[PDB]
Amino acid sequence: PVDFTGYWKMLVNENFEEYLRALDVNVALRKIANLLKPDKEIVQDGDHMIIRTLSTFRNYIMDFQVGKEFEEDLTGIDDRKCMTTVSWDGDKLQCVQKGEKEGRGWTQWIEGDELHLEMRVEGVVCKQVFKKVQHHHHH
Numbered sequence: 419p420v421d422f423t424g425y426w427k428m429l430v431n432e433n434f435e436e437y438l439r440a441l442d443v444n445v446a447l448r449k450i451a452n453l454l455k456p457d458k459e460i461v462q463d464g465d466h467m468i469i470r471t472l473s474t475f476r477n478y479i480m481d482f483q484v485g486k487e488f489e490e491d492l493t494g495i496d497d498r499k500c501m502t503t504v505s506w507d508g509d510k511l512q513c514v515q516k517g518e519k520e521g522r523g524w525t526q527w528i529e530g531d532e533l534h535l536e537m538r539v540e541g542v543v544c545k546q547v548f549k550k551v552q553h554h555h556h557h
């Protein structure tokens with residue numbers, strides 16, 4: 419069993435530039451984005467998951483049902499759309515983003531007070547780790 423509900427601050431962000439490059443994000447935006455240390459605010463409500471990734475540049479909000487494919491609008495990220503399914507894999511969330519890019523998806527899990535997020539596309543891997551925090555941030 420796992421519950422992702424909480425507020426989470428970025429601790430480390432490894433290889434994000436190459437991940438965005440593999441999504442063809444242009445270099446001007448990669449410059450802005452690799453400086454960001456976004457927070458995540460997550461509510462897990464049954465199998466209804468809301469993940470709000472919050473930064474000073476752009477936010478990205480996910481709101482989906484685990485196990486249920488949906489049309490994911492990535493306009494503000496890499497100017498694409500995917501048919502995405504996030505599924506349980508034991509206590510991990512395994513996301514497959516079907517679309518133009520091969521091998522696109524991510525895996526999210528918890529280890530103690532760390533939220534782990536591995537993002538993948540075209541064989542390129544970015545790893546982020548967040549720490550659970552308690553001072554709450556108005557947005």
Ligand SMILES: Cc1ccc(C2(c3noc(CN(C)Cc4cccs4)n3)CCCC2)cc1
Nearest residue numbers: 447451456469471473476477478494495524
């Ligand atoms: C050009 C550009 C690049 C990144 C981003 C953000 C970004 N940072 O990473 C990704 C890829 N994914 C959307 C992250 C996930 C959220 C939930 C599961 S995976 N976008 C920074 C914080 C949110 C948006 C916005 C815009």
